[PDB]
Swiss-Prot record, chains A, B:
The keyword Glycoprotein applies. Changing E14Q: Does not affect cholesterol-binding. Cholesterol binds at the interface between the PIN-like transporter region and the GPCR domain; these two regions likely coordinate to sense cholesterol and regulate mTORC1 activation. Residues 343-563 are annotated as: GPCR. One of its GO terms (molecular function) is cholesterol binding. It comes from Homo sapiens (Human). This is Lysosomal cholesterol signaling protein. Glycans are attached at N272, N344. Changing F9I: Strongly reduced cholesterol-binding. The chain crosses the membrane at residues 5-25, 46-66, 71-91, 100-120, 134-154, 177-197, 207-227, 237-257, 279-299, 310-330, 345-365, 378-398, 402-422, 440-460, 480-500, 511-531, 538-558. The lineage of its organism: Eukaryota, Metazoa, Chordata, Craniata, Vertebrata. The gene is GPR155. It is a multi-pass membrane protein. The chain holds residues 35 to 719 of 870 of the full protein.
C-alpha cells in the first residue's frame, strides 16, 4: 500500500497528544502565557530555522516533482483567490481589507511543519520518502506567493484606518514575508544547498539535528499552550464565517489539491499518481498555521476569528486527517482487509473517544453538573458513548471468539449505541423544554430501557452472523432495521426539537447539531444498505461517528472551565 | 577504535552550540528570564519524563553491566563523602550544613541527559550502543542515593536557621528526591518495562519520541538561557571553593570513575574493559546539572556559588571532554594516525578559538576598549591568537603541499604563536604597572617584532622538516629551542609581574594566570623533548592551548557586557 496507514494513529497521538500536553500545561498554569513565549521564541527563532536550513541544504532539487508543487500552490492560490474575492464582496467596507487579508491566508496556510511533517513522515517515510521534501517546499513557497497579498490587504486596512503610498504598502507586505524565518531560512538553505553540494558540514550537522529534532515536540507543545483561552464566544456571523473558512482550509483545499495533481501531474505510473493525489488531499487537511493568528495579532485585525479558527481547525483536522487517509487507502484494499481496517479504525477511535469520555464524565461528575438540566441528560449520553467505546475495544477481540462472547458484547455495544442516538434526541427535546419540570425519570428510561428492548428484539427476531468482522451486521437485516428505526426516531425527535427552539444551552445545541449529523450519516448507512464502495465509505463514517462521538462530547463539554474537590 | 572520537567535536558543537544559542537569546532579550520558564517547564515536566520513561521501558536489564554502574555510583559516593566531610570540617558553623548539602551534590550530579547523552551517543552509538543505557541508569540512581543526603543537610540548615524532628528532616529530603521527575519517571519506566515486556506500546511510542527527541536541543537551549547573568563576582574564598568543587566534579570524579571500573569490573576482554574505563572517565567529565542550582534556589542556600559553579563547570567541561576523549583514544592509535589525530584536534580547536576570537576582537574594537589599557595589549594578544587559528587551519592542508607554502604558513603560525606567549608576559607586567605611562610603543614592538625576529632565527639557523605532520617540529631542535626561549622569557616576565602585583584588572589577572599555565605546559613540552607517550600527551595539551587559548580570552573578555554602534 502507498500509505503506511497503520502508522498514522500513532503519529496523530504524537501530534495531538503533545498539543494536549501543551494545552493542559497552560490550562493548569504550569506554564503562564508570558512563560509560553520562551518556548515560542525557541521554536520560531531557533528550532524551526535549523529544521528548515538542514532540510533545504539536503534537498535534491533535480529529483523534485515540480508538478506536485505547482498543483498544491495552484490549489492554494485558487482557495486564496476565492476567499479573498468573496470577502471583498461579502464583508463590510470598514474591515473587508483585514478580512480579505487574513481569511485567504487562514484558508491556505497549513500547519505544515509541526503537524503535517510528522504525519507525512508516518504515512510515507517507508514508501515515498520523497513526499517529505514537499512540506519544506510547499509551505515556504506558499507563504512567499500568498502571504504578501494578504499582508498588502491588511496594510490597506491599516492605511484606511489611519492607500496613498502604494509601494510602501506593497513593501510592508513583502518585508513582513521576508522577516518570517520560514522564508529567509529557505532562501539561505537553498543558497547553502548550492554552496555545499547538498552536504551539511559534519561539524554543523549535529547542531542542526539537535535544534531541528527539538522543533516537532516543542512546536506542538507551544501550539497547545497557545490554544488556551482562545475560543471566545463569536457572534452567529463570525461563527458561520469561521465554519466556512475551516471548510475552505479542510475540505475545499484538499479537494483542489487532489484535483490539481490530477490535472497537472502528467506522470505515467498510476500507483504513483494515486499516492501523490492522496498525498495532495492529505496535505490540504493540515490545520491553519499558528502563524496566521500571529499575523492577526501583529495587524490587530480579525484576531478572535483567526485565533478561534486556528484552534478549531487544529482540533477538527485530527479526525479529518485520520478519516481521509483511511478513506483514500480503502480503494486499494481487498474487501476483507477493508473490514479489518474498519475494525482497526474503530479500535483507534474507541481509545481517543473513551479517554475523552472518561475525562468529560469526571468533569460532569466532580463539577456536580450531572445534577443539573440538561447536564444530567448529557451525562447519560456520555455513559452510553463510553460503553460503546469499551464494547468496540472488546469486539476487536471477541470477533474471533465464540458466540456466547459475541452476543453479550454486541448487546452491550448496540444497547449503548442506540442509547447514544436516543440521547441525542432526548437532549435536543430537553433544550426546547428548557428554552416545565421535564419528566426526567421517563426521559431516562426512554434513553436506556427502550434501546435494551430494541436489542432484545434482535435477540428475539434476528439471525446471528458470527462470521462477520463488523458488529454492524451481527444480526443482519434485523439489526439494520432496528438501527434505522432507532435513528429515524432520534433524528425526528432531535430535529423537530431544534425547530421548536450554568445551563450552557448553546453548547448543548452545538452538541446536538453535530450528533444529529452523525445520526443522519448512520441512518443513511442503514437505509442505503437496506434499499440497495461509496457504501463502505459511508459505513466507515458511521463507525467513525459511532465510536468517536465521545470526542465530540469532549470537544464541547470536556474542555469546560469548571472544576472541584 | 572503541570511541568514534571524530564524532565528538560535531556533538560538542551541538551541545555547546545550542547552549550558546540559549545564552545569546537570553543576553539579547529574545527570551526574558520569565519567558525562559516556559521552556524550562516544558523540558523538566514533559520532554525529560518522556525521554526517561521510553528509555527505561526499552532497557534490557538482563544485559546491563551492573559492575560499571556500581563503579560510577561508588565513585560518586566517594566524591560525595569527601566533599561533604571536608565541608563539615572546613566550613563555618552557620552555613556548613547548606554547604555540606549542596557542595557534594555539585561534585557528583552530572549534566547526564542534556550534555552527557548526545556526547555518549556520538562516541559510542556505533561501537558500544549499550553504553548509552548507563546514562539513564547512573543519573537517577545517583540522585536516589546521594541527593537525599544533601537535602537532609539542607533541611538541617533550614531547621538550624529556624534538628528536632529527625524523621521530618529525613522525610523532606526523601520527598524532594521523589518529587524529581528524574526519579519518579524512572520508577514508573521500570514498572512499565516489566508490565510491557520492554515494548513501548505502538500508539504511545511516537508521542514519547516527539517529547523525548525535543528534550536535547530544548534542554541545551534552556541551559544557555539559565547561564545568563549567573556568574557574579565571588569573594576569593568563594572562588577557591568553586575551583575546588569544579575540580571535584571534572577531575577527581572522572579519575575515580576510571579507577572504580578497574577495581570492580572483573570482565575478561581488555578492549571492553579499556573502553568501559574510558567511558567511566568521560562520564565523570560531564558538568554540574542545572538541577543543583535549582536545589540551591529552593533551599535558598549557597545560590551564587552553586549557580556560578554550574555555569563555569558547563563551560570548562567542553574542553575537558574533548581533551580527555582524545587522550584516552591515543594509546590505541598507531604513531602516525596519532599525529593525524593531533592535527585534527588542532583544526577543531582552531575553529572554536577563531570564532571566539573574532567575536572578542569585535567586542574590544566596537566597545573601543582596544584604546584603553590594558585592553589594547589584550587586543594584540587576541590578534596573535586569531592568526594562530587561521595558520593552523591552513597548516592542516599545507602539511601536504610544497615547502614554499609550508615555510610561509609556519612563519605566520609561529610568529603569531610566539606573540601569544610574549603577550601573556607583556599583559601581566602591564597589570603590575597599572596596579606610570607604560611604554606602549615599545611593548607593542616587543610583542610583534621580537617573535618575527625569533622566527627569522629559525629561517636562518634551522633544518626544514617538510615531512613532519606537526608544525611544532618543522624546524626541529632549533624550533624547540626558539619556542622554549620564548616561553622561558614570557613565563618569567608574567610570573615576576603577578608576584610584583573599566580597567578589569582582576579579569586580566585571571587571563594571565590561565595563559601562564598554558605557557608552562608548552615550556614543559619543549624542555621535555629537548632533555629526553606521556610526552605525546603533553604535546597534545600544548597544541590544545596553542590553538585554543583564544577560547580562554573569549571566556574572560568575549562574554563582557559592553556593546556599541
Ligand atoms: C514511482 O516513483 C518511484 C520514485 O522515482 C520509482 O522508483 C518507481 O519506479 C515509480 N513507480 C513506477 C511504477 O513507475
Ligand atoms: C565486548 O562486549 C560485546 C557486547 O557483549 C561483545 O559482543 C564482545 O564480544 C565483547 N568483546 C570481547 C572480545 O569479549
Amino acid at each position: 500500500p502507498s500509505m503506511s496507514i497503520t502508522r498514522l494513529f500513532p503519529a496523530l497521538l504524537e501530534c495531538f497528544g503533545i498539543v494536549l500536553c501543551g494545552y493542559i500545561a497552560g490550562r493548569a498554569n504550569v506554564i503562564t502565557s508570558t512563560q509560553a513565549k520562551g518556548l515560542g521564541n525557541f521554536v520560531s527563532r531557533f528550532a524551526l530555522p535549523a529544521l528548515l536550513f538542514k532540510n533545504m541544504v539536503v534537498l535534491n532539487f533535480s529529483n523534485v516533482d515540480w508538478s506536485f508543487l505547482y498543483s498544491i500552490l495552484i490549489a492554494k492560490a485558487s482557495v486564496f483567490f476565492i476567499v479573498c474575492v468573496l470577502t471583498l464582496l461579502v464583508a463590510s467596507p470598514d474591515s473587508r481589507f483585514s478580512k480579505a487579508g487574513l481569511f485567504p491566508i487562514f484558508a491556505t496556510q497549513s500547519n505544515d511543519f509541526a503537524l503535517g511533517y510528522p504525519i507525512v513522515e508516518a504515512l510515507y517515510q517507508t514508501t515515498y520518502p520523497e513526499y517529505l521534501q514537499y512540506i519544506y517546499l510547499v509551505a515556504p513557497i506558499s507563504l512567499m506567493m500568498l502571504n504578501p497579498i494578504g499582508f498588502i490587504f491588511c496594510e490597506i486596512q491599516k492605511w484606511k484606518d489611519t492607500s496613498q503610498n502604494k509601494i510602501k504598502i506593497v513593501g510592508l507586505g513583502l518585508l513582513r514575508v521576508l522577516q518570517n524565518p520560514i522564508v529567509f531560512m529557505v532562501f539561505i538553505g537553498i543558497a547553502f544547498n548550492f554552496i555545499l553540494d547538498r552536504k551539511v558540514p559534519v561539524y554543523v550537522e549535529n547542531f542542526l539535528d539537535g535544534l531541528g529534532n527539538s522543533f516537532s515536540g516543542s512546536a506542538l507543545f507551544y501550539l497547545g499552550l497557545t490554544m488556551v483561552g482562545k475560543i471566545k464566544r463569536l457572534k452567529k456571523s463570525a461563527f458561520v464565517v469561521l465554519i466556512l473558512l475551516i471548510t475552505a482550509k479542510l475540505l475545499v483545499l484538499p479537494l483542489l489539491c487532489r484535483e490539481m495533481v490530477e490535472l497537472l501531474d502528467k506522470g505515467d505510473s498510476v500507483v504513483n499518481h494515486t499516492s501523490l493525489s492522496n498525498y495532495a488531499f492529505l496535505y490540504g487537511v493540515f490545520p491553519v498555521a499558528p502563524g496566521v493568528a500571529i499575523f492577526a495579532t501583529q495587524f490587530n485585525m480579525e484576531v478572535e476569528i483567526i485565533t478561534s479558527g486556528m484552534v478549531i481547525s487544529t482540533f477538527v483536522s485530527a479526525p479529518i486527517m485520520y478519516v481521509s487517509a483511511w478513506l483514500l487507502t480503502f480503494p486499494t484494499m481487498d474487501p476483507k482487509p477493508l473490514a479489518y481496517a474498519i475494525q482497526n479504525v474503530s479500535f483507534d477511535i474507541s481509545i481517543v473517544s473513551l479517554i475523552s469520555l472518561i475525562w468529560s464524565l469526571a468533569i460532569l461528575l466532580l463539577s456536580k453538573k450531572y445534577k443539573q438540566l440538561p447536564h444530567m441528560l448529557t451525562t447519560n449520553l456520555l455513559i452510553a458513548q463510553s460503553i460503546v467505546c469499551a464494547g468496540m475495544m472488546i469486539w476487536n477481540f471477541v470477533k474471533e471468539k465464540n458466540f456466547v462472547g459475541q452476543i453479550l458484547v454486541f448487546v452491550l455495544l448496540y444497547s449503548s449505541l442506540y442509547s447514544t442516538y436516543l440521547w441525542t434526541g432526548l437532549l435536543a427535546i430537553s433544550l426546547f423544554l428548557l428554552k416545565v419540570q421535564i419528566p426526567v425519570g421517563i426521559i431516562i428510561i426512554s434513553g436506556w430501557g427502550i434501546p435494551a428492548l430494541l436489542v432484545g428484539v434482535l435477540l428475539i427476531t434476528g439471525k446471528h452472523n458470527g462470521d462477520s468482522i463488523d458488529s454492524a451486521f451481527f444480526y443482519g437485516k434485523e439489526q439494520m432495521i432496528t438501527t434505522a428505526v432507532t435513528l429515524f426516531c432520534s433524528i425526528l425527535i432531535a430535529g423537530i426539537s431544534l425547530m421548536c427552539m450554568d445551563q450552557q444551552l448553546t453548547r448543548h445545541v452545538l452538541l446536538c447539531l453535530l450528533l444529529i449529523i452523525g445520526l443522519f450519516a448512520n441512518l443513511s448507512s442503514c437505509l442505503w444498505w437496506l434499499f440497495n464502495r461509496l457504501y463502505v465509505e459511508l459505513q466507515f463514517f458511521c463507525a467513525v461517528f459511532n465510536f468517536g462521538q465521545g470526542f465530540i462530547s469532549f470537544g464541547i463539554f470536556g474542555l469546560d472551565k469548571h472544576l472541584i474537590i
